[PDB]
Amino acid sequence: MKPKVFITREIPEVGIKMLEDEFEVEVWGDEKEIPREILLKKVKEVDALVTMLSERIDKEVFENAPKLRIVANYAVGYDNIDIEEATKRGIYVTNTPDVLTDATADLAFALLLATARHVVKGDRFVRSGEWKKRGVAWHPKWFLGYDVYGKTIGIIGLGRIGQAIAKRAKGFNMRILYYSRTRKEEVERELNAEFKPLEDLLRESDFVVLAVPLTRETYHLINEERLKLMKKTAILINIARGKVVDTNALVKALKEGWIAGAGLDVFEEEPYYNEELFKLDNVVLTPHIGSASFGAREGMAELVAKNLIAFKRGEIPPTLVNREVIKIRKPGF
Amino acid sequence: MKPKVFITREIPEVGIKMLEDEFEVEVWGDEKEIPREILLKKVKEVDALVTMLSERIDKEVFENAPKLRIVANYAVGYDNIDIEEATKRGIYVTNTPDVLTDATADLAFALLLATARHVVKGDRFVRSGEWKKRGVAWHPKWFLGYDVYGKTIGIIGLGRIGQAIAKRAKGFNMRILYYSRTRKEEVERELNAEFKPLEDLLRESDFVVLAVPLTRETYHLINEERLKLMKKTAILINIARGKVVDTNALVKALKEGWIAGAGLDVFEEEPYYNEELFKLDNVVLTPHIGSASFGAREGMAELVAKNLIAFKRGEIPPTLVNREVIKIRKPGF
Numbered sequence: 001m002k003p004k005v006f007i008t009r010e011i012p013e014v015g016i017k018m019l020e021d022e023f024e025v026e027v028w029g030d031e032k033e034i035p036r037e038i039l040l041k042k043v044k045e046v047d048a049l050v051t052m053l054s055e056r057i058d059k060e061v062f063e064n065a066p067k068l069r070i071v072a073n074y075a076v077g078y079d080n081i082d083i084e085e086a087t088k089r090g091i092y093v094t095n096t097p098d099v100l101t102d103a104t105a106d107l108a109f110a111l112l113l114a115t116a117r118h119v120v121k122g123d124r125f126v127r128s129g130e131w132k133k134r135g136v137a138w139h140p141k142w143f144l145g146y147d148v149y150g151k152t153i154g155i156i157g158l159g160r161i162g163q164a165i166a167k168r169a170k171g172f173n174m175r176i177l178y179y180s181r182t183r184k185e186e187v188e189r190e191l192n193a194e195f196k197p198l199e200d201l202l203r204e205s206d207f208v209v210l211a212v213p214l215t216r217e218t219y220h221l222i223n224e225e226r227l228k229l230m231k232k233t234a235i236l237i238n239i240a241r242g243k244v245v246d247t248n249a250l251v252k253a254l255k256e257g258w259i260a261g262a263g264l265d266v267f268e269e270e271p272y273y274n275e276e277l278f279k280l281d282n283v284v285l286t287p288h289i290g291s292a293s294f295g296a297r298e299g300m301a302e303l304v305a306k307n308l309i310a311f312k313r314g315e316i317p318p319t320l321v322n323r324e325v326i327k328i329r330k331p332g333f
Numbered sequence: 334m335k336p337k338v339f340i341t342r343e344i345p346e347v348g349i350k351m352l353e354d355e356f357e358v359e360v361w362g363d364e365k366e367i368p369r370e371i372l373l374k375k376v377k378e379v380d381a382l383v384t385m386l387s388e389r390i391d392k393e394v395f396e397n398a399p400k401l402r403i404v405a406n407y408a409v410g411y412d413n414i415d416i417e418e419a420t421k422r423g424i425y426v427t428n429t430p431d432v433l434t435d436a437t438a439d440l441a442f443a444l445l446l447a448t449a450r451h452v453v454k455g456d457r458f459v460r461s462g463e464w465k466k467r468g469v470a471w472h473p474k475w476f477l478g479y480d481v482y483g484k485t486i487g488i489i490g491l492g493r494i495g496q497a498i499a500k501r502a503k504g505f506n507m508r509i510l511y512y513s514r515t516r517k518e519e520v521e522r523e524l525n526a527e528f529k530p531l532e533d534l535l536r537e538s539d540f541v542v543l544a545v546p547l548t549r550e551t552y553h554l555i556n557e558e559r560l561k562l563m564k565k566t567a568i569l570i571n572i573a574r575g576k577v578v579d580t581n582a583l584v585k586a587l588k589e590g591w592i593a594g595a596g597l598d599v600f601e602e603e604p605y606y607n608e609e610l611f612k613l614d615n616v617v618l619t620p621h622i623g624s625a626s627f628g629a630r631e632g633m634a635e636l637v638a639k640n641l642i643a644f645k646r647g648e649i650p651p652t653l654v655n656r657e658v659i660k661i662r663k664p665g666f
């Protein structure tokens with residue numbers, strides 16, 4: 001365990017342990033993210049880093065770290081890392097794909113059903129005591145929500161997570177429309193998902209679920225204009241990234257009935273608070289917990305430990321994001 | 334439009350109209366259940382009646398009802414009608430089956446997922462501004478919920494709804510197990526469901542969903558004994574009837590920790606208030622909104638009328654609950 005590695009947050013012990021035997025591990029104890037200052041300090045002698053999607057690994061971080069040769073992102077997304085810069089510096093950047101697919105997929109559908117049926121609102125009605133108080137028990141017109149079975153779901157970004165969401169959608173016998181960068185005949189037939197241009201999908205879909213990474217090409221992909229294309233009774237689910245949606249536009253689309261409601265797990269700024277958004281009833285919110293499942297986090301901690309260790313052994317990491325960096329340097333310390 | 338029909342509550346316009354040209358309709362207009370007396374008074378010269386769950390239609394009601402010949406229940410469950418006496422008095426009783434099947438199955442899953450993933454508690458942490466306030470964006474051990482995909486779902490009651498819940502589960506690649514009055518080969522194969530002893534189903538399921546009618550046999554089917562039998566990590570979902578569960582035992586099983594959580598749509602008293610339960614964070618509650626979907630309450634409405642409009646024409650109601658009554662008297666007024 002000669003190599004040094006800093007882990008920016010308390011991850012599953014199963015992972016730390018695995019590293020304890022090949023690396024000299026240091027871990028950030030405090031619950032709240034590591035201060036930007038304190039971070040540029042720790043990375044001084046480290047050879048590898050295990051970062052959260054919260055840390056901004058930009059050039060500054062790279063500069064204040066001469067021995068850093070691999071950064072293991074404890075997440076599947078990496079928009080919080082300066083990939084290109086890292087590749088030029090011969091630095092390997094890994095993420096944790098697959099191991100968290102079902103966790104995220106399950107939550108999307110949780111937000112879809114909950115948002116379409118008023119679970120979160122009804123619960124407040126029952127819990128608070130207002131249900132008892134009002135005296136009425138069961139009314140023919142209360143809490144009317146949207147059907148989900150047999151309806152049309154539109155998946156934007158048919159990758160690992162998106163495909164998972166389509167499988168669950170098959171249980172509900174929904175019609176599956178999807179918009180992604182390419183058409184994968186093999187996937188389409190298997191899940192029976194029909195490709196359609198984003199404008200058609202947002203026009204025909206009863207549920208629109210975002211499963212794309214955050215890129216310059218997906219930034220605010222869902223804007224005011226796009227929201228208008230949507231049915232007044234459609235719902236928008238976002239377990240992707242906050243910035244993929246123009247929050248101001250959404251609040252408007254909601255407050256003005258352009259769409260029925262929205263279920264959000266990700267926000268443009270985290271933690272997040274928005275009085276006008278949070279005031280709505282046809283909105284379901286969750287603190288970025290897409291992957292908050294016992295299995296997912298466990299498998300994430302293991303995958304992270306796998307990459308670094310493979311690296312130590314001069315092996316091409318299992319889940320390397322920037323493969324081009326392979327030619328700019330060799331894996332090792 | 335000679336026949337007279339009293340409708341206990343305001344239900345979808347589509348129904349009131351279909352009958353409008355076949356019956357002399359009167360619609361109780363208060364959101365709260367009709368008081369005992371007022372109901373007794375109103376049911377004097379009524380030839381038909383449209384009731385809601387909450388309406389306790391016993392012999393006392395049949396007495397003040399000299400012209401009552403049919404009772405259409407705006408619901409699929411009829412544990413609120415003294416069927417025996419109904420038959421004895423030659424009164425036909427119909428319900429609204431199937432039309433609300435998917436609406437209820439959907440919610441069953443809304444609950445299963447929302448309970449398994451702290452959706453209700455997440456929305457609170459986030460919505461109240463408590464998330465921003467705490468200043469921590471994302472932590473590897475926050476809101477860890479239970480995986481669902483690939484897990485075992487045990488369905489108590491494999492009827493129209495319980496089967497709809499199985500299909501839904503196929504979408505999450507769940508291992509389907511069910512306990513029910515009778516094994517149905519045709520259905521088992523189709524859904525790939527395995528019949529199992531109630532005792533086994535409760536020891537092997539990660540999720541237990543109740544979908545049985547309320548009967549002398551099902552009263553408190555789930556009690557302290559059975560609760561204890563469930564996995565310490567299992568979740569109980571009840572969209573059947575409140576009385577099928579021993580509320581007090583569940584509270585304990587939750588606090589004590591015999592099981593992980595419960596999503597309840599129905600209770601022993603409705604409206605319901607229980608300080609002890611309502612203070613648990615591993616319990617998701619909804620005001621008995623199982624069939625509250627536009628299409629459902631809509632279809633249910635057309636069926637009620639459909640049954641009444643066919644009876645008037647001297648025909649056996651499409652969804653007659655008591656077939657035994659066809660003999661005790663023919664169809665008609």
Ligand SMILES: NC(=O)c1ccc[n+]([C@@H]2O[C@H](COP(=O)([O-])OP(=O)(O)OC[C@H]3O[C@@H](n4cnc5c(N)ncnc54)[C@H](OP(=O)(O)O)[C@@H]3O)[C@@H](O)[C@H]2O)c1
Pocket residue numbers: 076077078097098100104156157158159160161162179180181182211212213214215217218239240241265266288289290291292
């Ligand atoms: N809420 C949570 O806790 C949580 C958990 C996990 C992930 N996430 C977020 O959601 C994402 C899920 O991605 P994944 O794990 O499924 O990775 P993935 O398999 O790479 O999926 C990404 C999909 O988006 C497509 N895509 C990319 N840019 C696009 C564009 N401009 N227009 C249309 N489609 C585009 C990709 O197409 P190609 O095949 O051409 O690349 C691919 O189909 C993560 O990257 C992260 O941002 C959130």
Ligand SMILES: NC(=O)c1ccc[n+]([C@@H]2O[C@H](COP(=O)([O-])OP(=O)(O)OC[C@H]3O[C@@H](n4cnc5c(N)ncnc54)[C@H](OP(=O)(O)O)[C@@H]3O)[C@@H](O)[C@H]2O)c1
Pocket residue numbers: 409410411430431433437489490491492493494495512513514515544545546547548550551572573574598599621622623624625
């Ligand atoms: N929460 C809501 O808003 C909502 C909405 C609709 C319905 N519900 C509830 O759901 C119930 C069932 O609806 P459904 O359409 O599924 O009716 P169903 O199909 O007639 O009944 C479902 C199954 O329950 C089984 N069963 C009955 N007693 C049993 C017992 N003691 N042990 C094991 N299995 C038993 C029946 O067996 P058999 O095949 O032998 O009959 C049937 O297979 C309704 O009565 C109502 O209480 C709730």
